[PDB]
Point group: D3
């Protein structure tokens, strides 16, 4: 049981809890409350004993263009700038990043197009990623926005792409392109479908997943994930706290607001 959100839906099909970003006209840009909603859906999936896999799917040509700048401008009532940003940015980010970090079900991202910023951080926290075609990329534009690492990217990017690649991309605001994703095994399967039909891609992933789970003992999947998660859980939780608190001086100084308004 949870409120409805017009930008994000979910459903359950057998052992699969499927979350769908459904706002393609705005490239599935997300506001603060939408990130919170996403975290609440993960927590709902996590409490359902019939769910073994949580699948995140999107719509249109982008997975998500990241945080909604119009919503950010609306957040610019509180005794100080610090208090405002603690409520609007710190809170949201620590909550949703935490929901991904601790999630006990196998978390699969269907990457139907590019992801940017905090949405791309969340993709990097998923356990398995499938791409629609070779035009997908991840962009973390923090240096261009006057921000720093978010959503656990301090840990996930070096871990999944290597340290030297991560510095080149983050320091100079360059994308992690399809080729770098394939070379680091970030994408487990490219479906090579046209960008004009995310829907067909999403259905095809689900169809393959129904085939792949046949005969598996699903509690083994969760048992294995529980052990695998313990390799970096501490580093992720440490990073979440420091990222969110260290970002405050950037917001309070004002640079991101200037730049979020080109």
């Amino acid at each position: 049981e949870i409120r409805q959100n017009e930008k994000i839906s979910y459903r359950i099909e057998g052992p699969f809890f499927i979350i769908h970003l459904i706002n393609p006209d705005n490239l599935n840009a997300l506001e603060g409350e939408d990130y919170i909603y996403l975290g609440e859906l993960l927590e709902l999936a996590d409490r359902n004993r019939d769910v073994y896999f949580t699948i995140i799917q999107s719509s249109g040509r982008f997975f998500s263009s990241g945080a909604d700048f119009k919503g950010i401008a609306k957040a610019q009532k509180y005794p100080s700038e610090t208090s405002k940003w603690v409520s609007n940015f710190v809170a949201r980010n620590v909550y949703v990043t935490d929901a991904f970090i601790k999630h006990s079900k196998v978390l699969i991202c269907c990457l139907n197009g590019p992801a940017i910023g905090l949405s791309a951080a969340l993709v990097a926290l998923c356990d398995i990623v499938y791409s629609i075609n070779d035009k997908v990329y991840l962009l973390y534009p923090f240096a261009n926005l006057g921000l720093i690492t978010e959503g656990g990217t301090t840990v996930s990017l070096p871990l999944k792409f290597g340290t030297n690649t991560t510095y080149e991309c983050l320091m100079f605001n360059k994308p992690f392109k399809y080729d770098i994703m394939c070379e680091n095994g970030f994408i487990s399967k490219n479906f090579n479908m046209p960008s004009s039909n995310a829907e067909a891609f999403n259905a095809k992933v689900l169809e393959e997943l129904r085939e792949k789970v046949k005969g598996l003992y699903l509690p083994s999947c969760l048992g294995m994930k529980k052990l695998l998660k313990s390799n970096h859980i501490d580093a992720f939780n440490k990073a979440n706290s420091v990222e969110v608190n260290e970002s405050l001086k950037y917001w309070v100084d004002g640079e991101p607001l200037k730049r979020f308004r080109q």
Copy 2:
């Protein structure tokens, strides 16, 4: 430069940045915005190159009775809505404040000294346990962490600080059964570095006397060494504190959302 707050003041005297909780009629109970203010003051002290020591002092017979329950009830009565869910409300009201103020203490680079003029409770007691040095007014001080009785869990880094400073077995006895860490336990674990043995009716005299002794003790010291040493000492547990901060604040949410603390905060 910072706004004023009627419940907390500060001043600078030489190398000392002094923070004073000044609401003794309410036992220096603090609302969310006051915890935030406290974190902002630490960050202000941390940026001031003339400050080597940040001293936290209070007033009256309590250091602080903890989070203000009236303010907590305000975050439940509406007051428009103005939140799409209970989760969203508690993320903004509890998660955010706690993660911010705990972090300000954990990372503080100046020597952080607590003048314990009476008991401390809850999140305020957690902050006392994050200070580097603690002086007590007399042997009637105690720390109480009443999480089990409020339907909550560890806050303000107590997951790490209590076992570290009081031992694990003592921590379980106190936290599981809502029992205070009393003066004798504090002294036996070296938590209190000096008991001034003054009457509880004059926090003001105690506070002045601590400052007077501190002015004497710093004479002849090379103060950048103090900071250099703290910078190394902090690295022993910094990772564990930062990890605990994130986890404590997120794991509390289900307790707030379930509603138990609100029932219990009501008497």
Copy 3:
């Protein structure tokens, strides 16, 4: 549901799962299968959603004199000495130590008299310890038996008694006496009752516990323990594996067997 064991019983009273060592004529010395049984009882308590506290109580004048030497002599069928000790010692020790380390309920030991060896290791893994009187002590006689640290004592003893004290006691086979236990806050309450009535002591602890839990929100107790456990869980699990494997060369060399037979 579990088999019966004549040396160890259990019962449930409200939120308390009570385990009772009931072989005072043999000072509650335990064989390998009894340590395993103890681990199985912990795991049973851990799965019961009505249990919040697991209380371990004993009988007579000793809590437990440790591993039963007669049973050890019986273990002296297997292709090698290594294989024998892997089955008899390694297996038992890793299993029972693990059951204590991961236990999610609040674990309380009623110390009715001295504990020795592996039984004393288990006492040091409990969250809270109450003593009957000031004659209790813990002895870890590994240096005298030709063995090394067991039951997580590599971590628990320095953690609960300090490093320098631990070296003095372990290197020279000296007890951790009541005074050192009180000074390190290892014992949370001394009941100051006569050693001739463990039964009255055990009942009195339970009576105080029923009083102390009134008004508490018990899920908070478990929530707090779950966070507290994460401080050292990794070090305990690492120690368990190394202790058990490093002990093998001592058993295979034969020294403990000579000495276990004075």
Copy 4:
């Protein structure tokens, strides 16, 4: 000095301690006592001051098909009892063997080289992933960890070794869906240091050719440097491996005791 085992032999040639799995008709499937024997051989090599490299070689078209299911069925049919409970049985049969052999690999101080003459499966594949260097016979080798299909979880340190050597996302795809780590994935992650590109019908020629190249490569090296370097490299993940060993072996128990793997091991 050690007993003989008809399924595994060893010999020493100069600085090389060579272990050979010699039961190709059964795809070098191993029973519990064989895993133990393998650990004993590692410990023997580790104590020999003339040995600098421990080389593991196999026979036939498979490196090893993993744990022998017939032997597993023996540990279920009785065979007197002779165990007070299912838990006690599995502690002795599974827990004990796994924790011992995994530990022998994790702590081994000599350079550990695997000659991969064909596929490896299960616990045997876990041991391959614990070796320092791996050479393949041809591009048809693969590693399979079929835990999800057997109703089990990670074994032999794979909790740590697979994400470390293949990356996290690749590891989840393979483990969650019971898919092999194929040659191409092995090459792309640098898991295989050299592919010899020889036919699968002659493991013997492959094994000899690896040894021949190794005799050439060690010429002129100061061999104590190899060991000194390994001693430092091992410290990067030694704690994580030891922690994982204990947890893997204990967490598997509920899967054995519940019975699922026995049903599934039966076809």
Copy 5:
């Protein structure tokens, strides 16, 4: 302010602190005091608030052939062999490795040819590496010199090249060649220029860097690096201390000196 060194110069251009190894006739082999000098330059760059990037460039056909053996022979006054090597090797290595490990500016290496030994260790500690052409390699000849890992290679090589590749190269004294560097993303861009003009390569890298920093908020770069560094800082500091002390027995035994003399 710092003394001059004829083998290494530096200059500052805008946000770039540029260090130039300028002894191509000796393949930029470095003596102990030159490594120390290099550490001092990093520490100077680190204290300059206008510097955001520290760029290390070399000359000729080699980046650096490593420690100068003629200088080593000079070091073979002190009460013991141990005391001599503590002063000559331990001290310098622990200092320069530490300067690279803690450096807070973005550290970029312009790899104009091969690097060997301690110089190659320093290349592996840089955040970003650009290569002149596909003939560059790194060689860590410790096994052939009778030494062990240096300059944090205990951590940096498995981290950046993987553990199995690291064992093959280190155990058998084999280079990490261009192909292995590209496959692990160690090199972020190959400029594909001729080895006869390091100068042109160096100028071209600086030109591209000036282009890539345009529009970026440079304090974000440093903020991000400060978080990224925390992933492995503890392991690097631990390794530094252990590498330098464990190498002593190799120097004192004398093997490296015999071998440094062929």
Copy 6:
């Protein structure tokens, strides 16, 4: 085999390797080369298979007053201040601290009077400490000398005395007195003998040790220590490297030299 040193002797008696500081007229103040010598003696004891305990004893009324200031003034040939202090301070500290941290034999300190500075740091690295009488203290005067923590005190002091006590003593240059030592179990036994006869104290400790080892299986002592050491070995090695490098800016700035001259 090792050279002789007039300020420090050693001998072997059965399983005991006994190191004796023998310069009471100068309160056993030690120069750099004497610290190095002390490290070499530990490494000699560590390589001797008949040694199970390494015992450090001193003479006169002080254990050691710390680093010899006259020797420090001599050290104030080198291209820079940095290079000088790297050779004189960094090198020696990193070497001797490492020798104590890694030592595999049981390390016992006979505290015949106060210890100061780096010598007191070494006392805090010993496994077991016995005091002559209740007038012993440890003083770490770093704040008064314009230095920072040394000899692993960053880790050993909070570990053995607690964090709040450590801040009070270090920040304000106050001694850890006998009472604080006894309350934290730092001292395992006070012999309560007069300060005018260190020799009798030293002989009495050895006599009690010969009595306490009787019947023990000494390889168990070492086996246990090897496991106990792993609890904090990484933190000690990390601290060693950081302490020695971070102290440099204090020496180079000059403050300690001014203050070492009163």
